[PDB]
């Protein structure tokens, strides 16, 4: 809607990491999203930024000392001797290790703290971090099939400028660690959309809205196996409208998870480009400070398509469906158009069930009313452009 200054941080090292063979969750989607953004000519209203690797003693702001020290010491050649810390944090059993793991966590946490600092100094209204998005882990855990929770690393880094923080999770495999870390405090409100069925987090309920000062201030909605665009609009607009009319947040952290797209390895939702765009569009419509972060997406074509669409609209330009030639020209679909087609799969959700969720949510919410900190030390990294327009 209104004109906004959108900042986007990307590290080239994020792309060249492979989690493993047969691995759905992977970092290669970030480099192709970056390439699509670079080749779509979005640089006219954008600035490029380089994500500095996370400093060790500031990385420990969320996690424990031994967990970070293990992550900086973990590698495939010594995982066999690392058995205790391998099984203690669910590392190598469900989430295998690889070369450059600590590098990935460092650059992801650096990008998240960079977005938080850009929010703090206020030069850019919106920060986009596709490089991070690791949003399932916990203080001493790699559960939820990831390794870090860099959103909660970036949320508290923006607490100093933003007292009230609002977080939204729209993809499946919701933010167990995100709502867990900010359970008992009203300062950060965690909203998450997920399905009751068993997922990588597994958690999420309708009665776990908070304890202590954070009571009634962490709303979770249990959804069903696939939502139509109209039903998702009817379940998203009133809830977020009531939240912004009651909570009065001063910041928004939006999880741009591609896991809820029409067809991926573990996703089970059926939203098209319109359905995924309205989540960001609605929370953009209030103009309060914003931080877009993305970690979801098991299929490259769908998550790259929706990330290019989000990058397009976020700058208030008309993003066309045609894809310019790039290194991934023969990648996205047969017709090579930027549109994720919603599958012909049934709408399990009920309007009566949605109305019941609305009524109990409204009745729930009616009762309520470190040597480098706050720093933006980085480099633009736009001197050389790797635009491959030649076959």
């Amino acid at each position: 809607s209104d004109k906004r200054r959108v900042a986007y941080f990307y590290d080239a090292d994020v792309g060249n990491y492979a989690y493993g063979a047969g691995h759905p969750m992977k970092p290669h989607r970030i480099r192709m999203a970056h390439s699509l953004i670079m080749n779509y000519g979005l640089y006219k209203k954008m600035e490029i930024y380089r994500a500095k690797p996370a400093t060790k003693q500031e990385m420990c702001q969320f996690h424990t000392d031994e967990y970070i020290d293990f992550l900086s010491r973990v590698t495939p050649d010594n995982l066999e001797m690392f058995k205790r810390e391998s099984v203690k944090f669910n590392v190598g059993d469900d989430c295998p290790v690889f070369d450059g793991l600590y590098e990935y966590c460092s650059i992801s946490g650096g990008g998240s703290m960079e977005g938080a600092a850009r929010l703090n100094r206020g030069k850019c209204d919106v920060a986009v971090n596709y490089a991070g998005g690791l949003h399932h882990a916990k203080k001493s855990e790699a559960s939820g099939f990831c390794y870090l929770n860099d959103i909660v690393l970036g949320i508290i880094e923006l607490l100093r400028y933003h007292p009230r923080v609002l977080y939204i999770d729209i993809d499946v495999h919701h933010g167990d660690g995100v709502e867990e870390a900010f359970y008992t405090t009203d300062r950060v409100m965690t909203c998450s959309f997920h399905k009751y069925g068993e997922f990588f987090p597994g958690t999420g309920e309708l009665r776990d809205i908070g304890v202590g000062a954070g009571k009634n201030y962490a709303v979770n909605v249990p959804l069903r196996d696939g939502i139509d665009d109209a039903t998702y609009r009817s379940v998203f607009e009133p809830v977020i409208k009531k939240i912004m009319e009651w909570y009065q947040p001063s910041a928004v952290v939006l999880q741009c998870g591609g896991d809820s797209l029409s067809g991926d390895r573990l996703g089970c939702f059926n939203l098209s480009m319109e359905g995924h765009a309205n989540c960001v569009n609605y929370v953009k419509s209030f103009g309060i400070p914003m931080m877009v972060v993305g970690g979801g997406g098991y299929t490259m074509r769908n998550v790259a398509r929706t990330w290019c669409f989000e990058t397009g609209l976020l700058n208030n330009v008309v993003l066309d469906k045609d894809l310019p030639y790039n290194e991934y020209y023969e990648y996205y679909g047969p017709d090579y158009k930027l549109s994720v087609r919603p599958s012909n799969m049934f709408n399990v959700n009920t309007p009566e069930y949605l109305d019941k969720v609305m009524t109990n949510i409204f009745a729930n919410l009616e009762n309520t009313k470190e040597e480098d900190s706050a720093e933006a030390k980085d480099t633009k990294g736009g001197s050389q452009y790797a635009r491959d327009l030649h076959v």
Binding site: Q61, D99, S140, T185, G202, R207, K215, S262, G263
Partner: protein
């Protein structure tokens, strides 16, 4: 539940919740309670009193426990009640698409890591070549080679070389540069050239495979539609549905109507549905020619009689038994299946005539091959007329089912899942309308329908006291205007 409150154990709010969720259909009991009643901790995410935390001496000085949590945590196992994890439902198409996509990702990741390594190495090479050899001989460096990443070059060296050779190669590189640099550059660039020359056709075959598999994978309802219609197009299922609909308006929460669905907004459906029935009857082989003519004339007469059509070219009540009612229900089923196509025809037609292929894909032969080029495209003509010509051709047997389904899902963008089995549903309609003249009671029922259609306290007596007592009866109401039919199911209650 009543006793637990009397034992001073159950709380007021808990008892109130149990009461308000026990009842709730009617509210006079709610106000009866509210006259004289005097009126979080989820399944997971529970408290840890003494978890291993509070270690403020490892660089975590402040802003680490203010709004943070280490006492209220949760695991996926606890919320799953110790049952493991369940995977998403899939089939062969989705897993093979995942496999091809993942291996394409693997190839592209290896190429991209290799080119990043080769570009870092070429800046290293020119920055060590531009000056003399005196400082080339002594170039001791820390790990990283001047970049921000420490393990990428080790990773690609391990990938291209052996396991134990990669570590010593990395060690040499680090300690003795400008010696093995030209040979390692030549080897890596030769590997990159061979990988790219393989990829220049490997991407082509990958794309050709995807162009056929992706549309089928995007279907999640039409793959099992055949078995669904095999196990759901039964008499008992239909009886179950109409009884379930009729018991939703009973007492203890009747009505003269049992169904307000099955609207008839347009009469253009009858024209081309009769054309489809005519051509399928013309292209049948298990029926006799006089029987074919009899079926044709009976269908034409029934369609011209029940509805307001005039047969240009190729309050009233109806009481129906199971067979006729099932015939009418199947007719409105196909009516709604075609109305789902007709209602959304405008914007899909607009997007398919305004669809433009991009210009850069016309250079490197990125066109789709052996998928739809025989004339299966819907451009240049009406989508509905083209799809019905497609259905007639499929009935003709000269066009296979796979291409029919592929064109159906491609043209309407997975919005024509109901037309995946139109030939089978019209075949079933034909052979079950064969049962109408096969016996004599259904013929008499049809004769009574013809008698009472053209210009009714005796209808119930005639429709009850003329058969065996134990059989199902249905009532269909037809309105003069708006063509809005309604079906009422009454049986074993008028005697």
């Amino acid at each position: 539940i009543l006793n637990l409150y009397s034992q001073d154990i159950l709380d007021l709010d808990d008892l109130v919740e149990k009461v308000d969720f026990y009842l709730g259909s009617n509210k006079e009991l709610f106000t009866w309670f509210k006259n004289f009643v005097g009126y979080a901790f989820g399944p997971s995410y529970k408290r840890l009193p003494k978890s291993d935390t509070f270690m403020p001496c490892s660089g975590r000085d402040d802003m680490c426990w203010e709004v943070l949590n280490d006492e209220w945590v949760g695991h996926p196992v606890w919320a799953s009640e110790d049952s493991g994890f369940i995977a998403h439902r899939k089939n062969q198409y989705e897993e093979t698409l995942f496999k091809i996509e993942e291996e394409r990702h693997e190839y592209d990741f290896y190429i991209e890591s290799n080119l990043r390594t080769i570009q870092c190495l070429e800046t290293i090479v020119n920055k060590i070549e531009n000056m003399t050899e005196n400082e080339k001989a002594n170039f001791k460096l820390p790990p990283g080679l001047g970049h921000t990443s420490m393990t990428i070059y080790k990773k690609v060296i391990r990938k291209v070389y052996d396991k134990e050779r990669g570590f010593e190669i990395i060690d040499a590189l680090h300690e003795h540069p400008a010696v093995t640099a030209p040979v390692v550059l030549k080897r890596l660039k030769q590997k990159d050239e061979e990988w790219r020359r393989a990829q220049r056709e490997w991407n082509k075959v990958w794309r050709e495979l995807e162009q056929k598999v992706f549309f089928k994978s995007l279907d999640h309802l039409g793959l099992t539609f055949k078995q669904a219609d095999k196990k759901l197009l039964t008499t008992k299922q239909l009886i179950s549905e109409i009884s379930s609909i009729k018991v939703d308006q009973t007492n203890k929460k009747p009505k003269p109507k049992s169904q307000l669905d099955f609207d008839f907004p347009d009469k253009n459906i009858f024209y081309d549905i009769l054309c489809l029935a005519d051509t399928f009857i013309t292209h049948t082989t298990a029926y006799s020619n006089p029987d074919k003519e009899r079926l044709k004339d009976l269908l034409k007469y029934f369609i011209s009689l029940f509805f307001s059509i005039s047969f240009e070219k190729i309050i009233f009540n109806l009481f129906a038994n199971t067979n006729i009612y099932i015939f009418f229900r199947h007719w409105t089923t196909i009516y709604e299946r075609l109305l789902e196509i007709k209602q959304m025809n405008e914007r899909v037609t607009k997007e398919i005539n305004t669809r433009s292929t991009v210009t850069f894909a016309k250079d490197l032969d990125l066109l789709s091959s052996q998928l739809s080029e025989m004339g299966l495209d819907f451009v240049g003509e009406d989508a509905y007329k083209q799809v019905l010509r497609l259905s007639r051709r499929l009935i003709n047997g000269d066009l296979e089912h796979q291409w029919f389904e592929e064109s159906l899902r491609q043209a309407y963008n997975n919005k024509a899942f109901k037309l995946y089995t139109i030939d089978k549903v019209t075949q079933s309609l034909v052979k079950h309308a064969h049962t109408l003249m096969t016996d004599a009671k259904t013929a008499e029922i049809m004769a009574l329908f013809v008698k009472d259609r053209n210009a009714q306290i005796i209808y119930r007596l005639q429709v009850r006291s003329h058969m065996s007592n134990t059989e199902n009866m249905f009532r269909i109401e037809f309105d003069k205007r708006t063509l809005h039919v309604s079906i009422q199911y009454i049986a074993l209650d008028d005697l």
